[model samples]
Target: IELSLEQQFSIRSFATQVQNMSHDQAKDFLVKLYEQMVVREATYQELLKHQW
Candidate 1:
């Protein structure tokens, strides 16, 4: 999947912030982000229902 420019910037910012994290800490953060992305489709659908 292609990331939007905003996503790329956010990820780059996050990477810089975590540059000093311990390996285990970085691993945990990555795992949690993966889990969130996995369920993001459902969240997107719900948001779509709320039409602004």
Candidate 2:
């Protein structure tokens, strides 16, 4: 789960660049990313639910 420095740097640059957005899309982008975990957790919690 560790990000390499080059990969981390690019994501940081993209995060910073989103702030220059004039539309309300900066927050939308953040919200969309956050929902990825909600999507991820659907099966995750189900798997945990069945294990003893």
Candidate 2, residues 1-52: lDDT per residue as tens digits? Answer: 9999999999899978887876777778778978998989897999899995
Which stretches in model 2 have alpha-carbon errors above 4 Å?
1-3, 41-52
User: Which whole-number lDDT from 0 to 100 does residue 48 have in model 2?
Assistant: 92
| Model 2: ten consecutive residues of lowest lDDT | 21-30
Give the true-structure RMSD of model 2: 4.0
RMSD of 1: 3.5
Q: Can you give the lDDT of residue 46 in candidate 1?
A: 85
Q: Compose the digit string of candidate 1's lDDT tens values, residues 1-52.
A: 9999999999899879899899999999999989999799789988999996
Candidate 1 global TM-score: 0.57
* TM-score, structure 2 vs. true: 0.43
